[PDB]
């Protein structure tokens, strides 16, 4: 469990193991006093670098729980097809409704 009032606490695995919904209220219930007794070893700019890599890895975990809601992502653009010498590489204008009943 990471503590958001200390820069030397947040790692990538502490944010990823916490859920996306649980990441909302954990950041809103922190401490207003910022502690400077133990800073991050890569500087204060490096603690921003470590925290947000765990959020984008949690979007991949959110896509797993919603894999029964959307479909397999088709290739979007040209140049990517298995058999290109008889048919071209298609690509979707993704304006549809990705939804599984």
């Amino acid at each position: 469990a990471p503590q958001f009032h200390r820069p030397s606490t947040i790692t990538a695995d502490n944010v990823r193991a916490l859920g996306m919904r649980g990441l909302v209220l954990a950041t809103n219930n922190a401490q207003f006093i910022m502690d400077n007794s133990y800073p991050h070893p890569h500087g204060t700019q490096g603690a921003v670098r470590e925290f947000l890599r765990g959020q984008a890895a949690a979007l991949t975990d959110l896509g797993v729980t919603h894999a029964n809601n959307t479909f397999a992502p088709q290739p979007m653009f040209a140049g990517d097809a298995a058999a290109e010498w008889l048919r071209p590489s298609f690509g979707l204008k993704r304006t549809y409704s990705p939804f599984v009943v």
Binding site: M20, L23, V24, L52, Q55, A56, L59, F99, V101
Partner: protein, 49 residues
């Protein structure tokens, strides 16, 4: 980026359709039960889209 991947997504009921109205359906993410401070789907509702 810290408030783009910051939203409230309720899980859909088994066998139910998609939420379309933020005003009535509480499973809609822009519903006033989901409009928390400091988030962007409430900022989808502060600036109404």
């Amino acid at each position: 980026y810290a408030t783009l991947q910051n939203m409230v997504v309720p899980e859909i009921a088994p066998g139910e359709e998609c939420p379309s109205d933020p005003v009535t359906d509480p499973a809609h993410p822009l519903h006033p039960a989901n409009l928390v401070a400091n988030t962007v789907k409430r900022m989808f509702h502060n600036g109404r889209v």
